[PDB]
Design an enzyme around this catalytic site. Structure first.
Site, PDB file in Angstrom:
ATOM      1  CG  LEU A   1      13.606  44.072   1.128  1.00 37.25           C
ATOM      2  CD1 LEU A   1      13.298  45.513   0.789  1.00 37.25           C
ATOM      3  CD2 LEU A   1      12.729  43.604   2.272  1.00 37.25           C
TER       4      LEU A   1
ATOM      5  CD  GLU B   1       8.490  50.606   0.240  1.00 36.75           C
ATOM      6  OE1 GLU B   1       9.513  50.016   0.682  1.00 36.75           O
ATOM      7  OE2 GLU B   1       7.476  50.846   0.948  1.00 36.75           O
TER       8      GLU B   1
HETATM    9  N1  LIG Z   1       9.065  43.719   2.963  1.00 38.88           N
HETATM   10  C1  LIG Z   1       9.029  44.171   4.221  1.00 38.88           C
HETATM   11  O1  LIG Z   1       8.355  45.150   4.532  1.00 38.88           O
HETATM   12  C2  LIG Z   1       9.872  43.543   5.194  1.00 38.88           C
HETATM   13  C3  LIG Z   1      10.657  42.451   4.855  1.00 38.88           C
HETATM   14  N2  LIG Z   1      11.430  41.774   5.766  1.00 38.88           N
HETATM   15  C4  LIG Z   1      12.143  40.544   5.337  1.00 38.88           C
HETATM   16  O2  LIG Z   1      11.475  39.502   6.113  1.00 38.88           O
HETATM   17  C5  LIG Z   1      12.475  38.578   6.630  1.00 38.88           C
HETATM   18  C6  LIG Z   1      12.684  38.715   8.151  1.00 38.88           C
HETATM   19  O3  LIG Z   1      11.429  38.302   8.708  1.00 38.88           O
HETATM   20  P1  LIG Z   1      11.087  36.952   9.521  1.00 38.88           P
HETATM   21  O4  LIG Z   1      11.771  35.795   8.950  1.00 38.88           O
HETATM   22  O5  LIG Z   1       9.607  36.888   9.687  1.00 38.88           O
HETATM   23  O6  LIG Z   1      11.834  37.130  10.945  1.00 38.88           O
HETATM   24  P2  LIG Z   1      11.664  38.190  12.160  1.00 38.88           P
HETATM   25  O7  LIG Z   1      12.331  39.486  11.889  1.00 38.88           O
HETATM   26  O8  LIG Z   1      10.305  38.194  12.682  1.00 38.88           O
HETATM   27  O9  LIG Z   1      12.661  37.456  13.172  1.00 38.88           O
HETATM   28  C7  LIG Z   1      12.331  36.177  13.728  1.00 38.88           C
HETATM   29  C8  LIG Z   1      13.028  36.104  15.098  1.00 38.88           C
HETATM   30  O10 LIG Z   1      12.708  37.258  15.937  1.00 38.88           O
HETATM   31  C9  LIG Z   1      12.350  36.764  17.253  1.00 38.88           C
HETATM   32  N3  LIG Z   1      10.908  37.040  17.393  1.00 38.88           N
HETATM   33  C10 LIG Z   1       9.942  37.226  16.483  1.00 38.88           C
HETATM   34  N4  LIG Z   1       8.824  37.529  17.111  1.00 38.88           N
HETATM   35  C11 LIG Z   1       9.081  37.530  18.419  1.00 38.88           C
HETATM   36  C12 LIG Z   1       8.297  37.765  19.480  1.00 38.88           C
HETATM   37  N5  LIG Z   1       7.009  38.057  19.239  1.00 38.88           N
HETATM   38  N6  LIG Z   1       8.796  37.712  20.728  1.00 38.88           N
HETATM   39  C13 LIG Z   1      10.160  37.431  20.914  1.00 38.88           C
HETATM   40  N7  LIG Z   1      10.966  37.158  19.814  1.00 38.88           N
HETATM   41  C14 LIG Z   1      10.385  37.230  18.587  1.00 38.88           C
HETATM   42  C15 LIG Z   1      12.753  35.318  17.304  1.00 38.88           C
HETATM   43  O11 LIG Z   1      14.144  35.312  17.681  1.00 38.88           O
HETATM   44  P3  LIG Z   1      14.739  34.234  18.710  1.00 38.88           P
HETATM   45  O12 LIG Z   1      14.767  32.993  17.889  1.00 38.88           O
HETATM   46  O13 LIG Z   1      16.045  34.804  19.042  1.00 38.88           O
HETATM   47  O14 LIG Z   1      13.748  34.195  19.800  1.00 38.88           O
HETATM   48  C16 LIG Z   1      12.542  34.901  15.863  1.00 38.88           C
HETATM   49  O15 LIG Z   1      13.342  33.755  15.491  1.00 38.88           O
HETATM   50  C17 LIG Z   1      13.766  38.953   5.930  1.00 38.88           C
HETATM   51  O16 LIG Z   1      13.867  38.256   4.664  1.00 38.88           O
HETATM   52  C18 LIG Z   1      13.608  40.456   5.705  1.00 38.88           C
HETATM   53  O17 LIG Z   1      14.401  40.932   4.621  1.00 38.88           O
HETATM   54  C19 LIG Z   1      11.431  42.201   7.110  1.00 38.88           C
HETATM   55  C20 LIG Z   1      10.679  43.323   7.458  1.00 38.88           C
HETATM   56  C21 LIG Z   1       9.856  44.012   6.535  1.00 38.88           C
HETATM   57  C1  LIG Z   2      12.335  49.593   3.264  1.00 38.81           C
HETATM   58  C2  LIG Z   2      11.504  48.320   3.152  1.00 38.81           C
HETATM   59  C3  LIG Z   2      10.307  48.453   3.895  1.00 38.81           C
HETATM   60  N1  LIG Z   2       9.259  49.118   3.347  1.00 38.81           N
HETATM   61  C4  LIG Z   2       8.077  49.216   4.012  1.00 38.81           C
HETATM   62  N2  LIG Z   2       7.066  49.882   3.467  1.00 38.81           N
HETATM   63  N3  LIG Z   2       7.903  48.671   5.239  1.00 38.81           N
HETATM   64  C5  LIG Z   2       8.890  47.998   5.838  1.00 38.81           C
HETATM   65  N4  LIG Z   2       8.737  47.439   7.043  1.00 38.81           N
HETATM   66  C6  LIG Z   2      10.118  47.872   5.172  1.00 38.81           C
HETATM   67  O1  LIG Z   2      11.100  47.166   5.789  1.00 38.81           O
HETATM   68  C7  LIG Z   2      12.010  47.942   6.628  1.00 38.81           C
HETATM   69  C8  LIG Z   2      12.949  46.917   7.274  1.00 38.81           C
HETATM   70  C9  LIG Z   2      13.949  46.588   6.156  1.00 38.81           C
HETATM   71  O2  LIG Z   2      14.690  47.792   5.959  1.00 38.81           O
HETATM   72  C10 LIG Z   2      15.508  47.844   4.837  1.00 38.81           C
HETATM   73  C11 LIG Z   2      16.523  48.793   4.822  1.00 38.81           C
HETATM   74  C12 LIG Z   2      17.357  48.899   3.708  1.00 38.81           C
HETATM   75  C13 LIG Z   2      17.227  48.052   2.608  1.00 38.81           C
HETATM   76  C14 LIG Z   2      18.129  48.171   1.525  1.00 38.81           C
HETATM   77  C15 LIG Z   2      19.020  47.131   1.213  1.00 38.81           C
HETATM   78  N5  LIG Z   2      18.994  46.017   1.927  1.00 38.81           N
HETATM   79  N6  LIG Z   2      19.891  47.204   0.181  1.00 38.81           N
HETATM   80  C16 LIG Z   2      19.938  48.309  -0.566  1.00 38.81           C
HETATM   81  N7  LIG Z   2      20.798  48.402  -1.588  1.00 38.81           N
HETATM   82  N8  LIG Z   2      19.107  49.330  -0.305  1.00 38.81           N
HETATM   83  C17 LIG Z   2      18.201  49.318   0.700  1.00 38.81           C
HETATM   84  C18 LIG Z   2      17.402  50.484   0.805  1.00 38.81           C
HETATM   85  C19 LIG Z   2      16.271  50.232  -0.183  1.00 38.81           C
HETATM   86  C20 LIG Z   2      16.230  47.089   2.622  1.00 38.81           C
HETATM   87  C21 LIG Z   2      15.375  46.977   3.732  1.00 38.81           C
END
Ligand SMILES: NC(=O)C1=CN([C@@H]2O[C@H](COP(=O)(O)OP(=O)(O)OC[C@H]3O[C@@H](n4cnc5c(N)ncnc54)[C@H](OP(=O)(O)O)[C@@H]3O)[C@@H](O)[C@H]2O)C=CC1
Ligand SMILES: CCc1nc(N)nc(N)c1OCCCOc1ccc(-c2c(N)nc(N)nc2CC)cc1
Length: 186
Positions: A22, A30
């Site tokens: 993140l 959160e």
């Molecule tokens: N703030 C938030 O709420 C969230 C934050 N994050 C952060 O976002 C980043 C991860 O996201 P991102 O980079 O977009 O990557 P994704 O998690 O979307 O992963 C990308 C990989 O998943 C596969 N993929 C994605 N979409 C499809 C599909 N529709 N069909 C089949 N395979 C698919 C592919 O793998 P392959 O190449 O093997 O086909 C692709 O290379 C991280 O930094 C994470 O920490 C993630 C979730 C929530």
């Molecule tokens: C919770 C973030 C998050 N929040 C919302 N509203 N939607 C999402 N899709 C999302 O993404 C979940 C997919 C990612 O899930 C996580 C798990 C744990 C953590 C972590 C971490 N990486 N390191 C620590 N120390 N703590 C935590 C809990 C803080 C971060 C992301």
């Protein structure tokens, strides 16, 4: 199978990720909100299912995966089976949504929650149908390498209230944020 929803936390500059984590320091409450919303089913005997991309799966700390109390489905076209700890693997979002309707999961799955990342969100958000977005607005800029897609407000209505979602400004580690729920039906 019940509702389809996306859930995300996003910075002011639309950032969701940086270097496989993140963009902001951990926000404990959160995460507790994310866990609560995705885990809670409104139907007895059923479980919610979470759909995520491969990089999202590996971004989750090992102690938190699989996401407990939910069926965990990973999207990948390279993987040959689900990752260690995960429950299911699908090759496309359409394929994932069909799998929920197979005899396997038809009556075990209540809500479907797309929990990231960008490409999964984008496809879901631009697919016709009934869809809600649960969006946590982190109210600062954070350097990011991964972004949330545009929310088209012609289609997505910001709801003025939603049960189980606080409406006032939250703060952890000197970072303010607020919860939002959007709904489209097209
Ligand atoms: N703030 C938030 O709420 C969230 C934050 N994050 C952060 O976002 C980043 C991860 O996201 P991102 O980079 O977009 O990557 P994704 O998690 O979307 O992963 C990308 C990989 O998943 C596969 N993929 C994605 N979409 C499809 C599909 N529709 N069909 C089949 N395979 C698919 C592919 O793998 P392959 O190449 O093997 O086909 C692709 O290379 C991280 O930094 C994470 O920490 C993630 C979730 C929530
Ligand atoms: C919770 C973030 C998050 N929040 C919302 N509203 N939607 C999402 N899709 C999302 O993404 C979940 C997919 C990612 O899930 C996580 C798990 C744990 C953590 C972590 C971490 N990486 N390191 C620590 N120390 N703590 C935590 C809990 C803080 C971060 C992301």
């Amino acid at each position: 199978v019940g509702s389809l929803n996306c859930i995300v936390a996003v910075s002011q500059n639309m950032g969701i990720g940086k270097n496989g984590d993140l963009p902001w320091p951990p926000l404990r409450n959160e995460f507790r909100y994310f866990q609560r919303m995705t885990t809670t089913s409104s139907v007895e005997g059923k479980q919610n299912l979470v759909i995520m991309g491969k990089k999202t799966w590996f971004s989750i700390p090992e102690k938190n995966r699989p996401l407990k109390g939910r069926i965990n489905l990973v999207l990948s076209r390279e993987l040959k089976e689900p990752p260690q700890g995960a429950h299911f693997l699908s090759r496309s979002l359409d394929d994932a949504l069909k799998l929920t309707e197979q005899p396997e999961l038809a009556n075990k799955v209540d809500m479907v929650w797309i929990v990231g990342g960008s490409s999964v969100y984008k496809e879901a958000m631009n697919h016709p149908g009934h869809l809600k977005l649960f969006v946590t607005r982190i109210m600062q800029d954070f350097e990011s390498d991964t972004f949330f897609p545009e929310i088209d407000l012609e289609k997505y209505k910001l709801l003025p209230e939603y049960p189980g979602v606080l409406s006032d400004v939250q703060e952890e580690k000197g970072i303010k944020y607020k919860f939002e729920v959007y709904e489209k039906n097209d």
